[PDB]
Amino acid sequence: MESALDQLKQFTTVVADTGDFHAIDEYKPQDATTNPSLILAAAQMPAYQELVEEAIAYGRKLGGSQEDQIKNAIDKLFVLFGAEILKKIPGRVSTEVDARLSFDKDAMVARARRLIELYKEAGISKDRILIKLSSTWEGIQAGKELEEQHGIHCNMTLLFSFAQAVACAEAGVTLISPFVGRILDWHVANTDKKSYEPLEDPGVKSVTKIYNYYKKFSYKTIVMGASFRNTGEIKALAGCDFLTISPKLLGELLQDNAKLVPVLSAKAAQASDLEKIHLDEKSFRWLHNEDQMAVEKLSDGIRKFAADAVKLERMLTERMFN
Amino acid sequence: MESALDQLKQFTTVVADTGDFHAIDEYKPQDATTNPSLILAAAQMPAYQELVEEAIAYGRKLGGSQEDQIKNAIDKLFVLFGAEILKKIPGRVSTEVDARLSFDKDAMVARARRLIELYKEAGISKDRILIKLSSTWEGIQAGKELEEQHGIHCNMTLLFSFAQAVACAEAGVTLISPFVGRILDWHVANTDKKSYEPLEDPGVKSVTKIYNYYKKFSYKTIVMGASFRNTGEIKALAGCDFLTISPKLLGELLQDNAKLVPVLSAKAAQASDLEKIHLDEKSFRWLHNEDQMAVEKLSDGIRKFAADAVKLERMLTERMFN
């Protein structure tokens, strides 16, 4: 159209990164994403206290130990936000399984089926859902199993290293969400270069590289850049399959109207010099370890989400067991 | 009275951390330790160029590609330093398998058997050798397998988290070498404190905790504190089974003669409050990830050693193939 946002929609499928579904439709996204940190934030908003009470009652109604109830309440809460979001958009929503299961393959699978079940009980088809999993080797294997054995589509997140990107591709997962701004954060905090040209942004380069690898070798996994610090990073990735953006940045993209030029494409990726590689667990863990930023961000990413999960549990138990 | 070193020898078995075996006997250690880093340093010393030429001659004979001949040369070089060290001491020497195999369980095992073989060809019994392995889950499993299936004794190194310490204990490895000063380095660089009291030193606390857990629950694995920044850390660990110290600090302990008080003791540990826990891979990786310092130091520790290995290979190929 004319705004940067509408222009971006010509080259990339825009996705809204938030749990605050009231602010969604203003940007008309295709899909939506949520994570432990977003649900937490939104769950504390006055406007959504109604969903929380319903989730609590669900816990209460299913009964069992208090743990069965906080788990089921939280699981339902996620599903509730999910369903509401779905009424506002035409595509899929991403619901993440607890980060504390990041290294437990079977737990992530079982928990994923559980979420898909809860959604099913609410009349929502799994085709509208993307289960978010931490991109650890086990999370990726959980993704593989979910896709191949249960037809459950996944959103591999907290993806930082090229190794992770590769393992996900071979695992044939539906979608990956490479974090861009957090890569910038690491380079800003550790290296001595605190600034980057949109195109030089480390995060943008990781996603650009991953995108070229995926397209050049015909992997059907969807590349969705995520977590952004500015709109320059977003514009430098125009052309990417998908880009999940925060309401704040979506709003900025809706405000300005400079000419937006596509940057990523199947033709440029085909001209890049990347060579195909195969990774078993050993090679994966090694190649991943060689990427310090990735090792440290994936690790801290898991702790932060887990913490958001712990904080959400606490407030809820305090709320339903005084 | 006596020197701090000789006093420490009453409560702890002293081990020399170095490849420079000429400076060893001055401190009369029980065991000795070496690593891909120390060997690198060692081989570049004029005094040991004789061992390098012998190692080179060995590798050319086995043949293969440049990388191959370089492998046998390096393997022999390690063994040669090992043998020389053994002539100077009554105990065991630690030889580490390439850090680049840290995530490859079967490679570490095969490579370990190989080193034990080379030593055997040199008339050295395996009872005199401790194969050093990175303390990753696979390295620990390699240790377990080596001990149980081949009677090969291991030195689990780059041990930082309590999880690692636990996994090693259940794996029944012969010895673990918890790094002390590198834990200090992490806390100095990341937290905002510059100096701690010997007893408050994070590194000292990690080893103290590990020691109490081992003794309290009767694990026979030997606890050997390693990598020290100062002698205060060493004195705060007096009583530990073993302590491998650099020639520099050994020299300082030999110069001062203040009264040294034992700090760690199995009986004290046994009469303490710590709960026994079991860790499978899942629990291990999770408990380990909860320790940021450990996650980052183990990870960087592997990259650094691997780099020392890469540098040693290069210098050698340039020397035997130009």
Swiss-Prot record, chains A, B:
One of its GO terms (cellular component) is cytoplasm. Pfam families: TAL_FSA (PF00923). Its EC number is 2.2.1.2. The keyword Phosphoprotein applies. It comes from the Eukaryota. The modification N6-acetyllysine is found at residues 105, 209, 259, 276, 311. One of its GO terms (molecular function) is monosaccharide binding. The modification Phosphoserine is found at residues 227, 246. Keywords: Acetylation, Cytoplasm, Disease variant, Nucleus, Pentose shunt, Phosphoprotein, Schiff base, Transferase. Pathway: Carbohydrate degradation; pentose phosphate pathway; D-glyceraldehyde 3-phosphate and beta-D-fructose 6-phosphate from D-ribose 5-phosphate and D-xylulose 5-phosphate (non-oxidative stage): step 2/3. One of its GO terms (biological process) is fructose 6-phosphate metabolic process. Signal peptide: none annotated. It catalyses: D-sedoheptulose 7-phosphate + D-glyceraldehyde 3-phosphate = D-erythrose 4-phosphate + beta-D-fructose 6-phosphate. The active site is at residue 132. The first 10 amino acids are essential for nuclear localization. Belongs to the transaldolase family. Type 1 subfamily. It is linked to Transaldolase deficiency: An inborn error of the pentose phosphate pathway resulting in early-onset multisystem disease. Clinical features include growth retardation, dysmorphic features, cutis laxa, congenital heart disease, hepatosplenomegaly, telangiectases of the skin, pancytopenia, and bleeding tendency. Homodimer. Heterodimer with isoform 2. Interacts with KPNA1 and KPNA4. Catalyzes the rate-limiting step of the non-oxidative phase in the pentose phosphate pathway. Catalyzes the reversible conversion of sedheptulose-7-phosphate and D-glyceraldehyde 3-phosphate into erythrose-4-phosphate and beta-D-fructose 6-phosphate. Not only acts as a pentose phosphate pathway enzyme, but also affects other metabolite pathways by altering its subcellular localization between the nucleus and the cytoplasm. This is Transaldolase. It comes from Homo sapiens (Human).
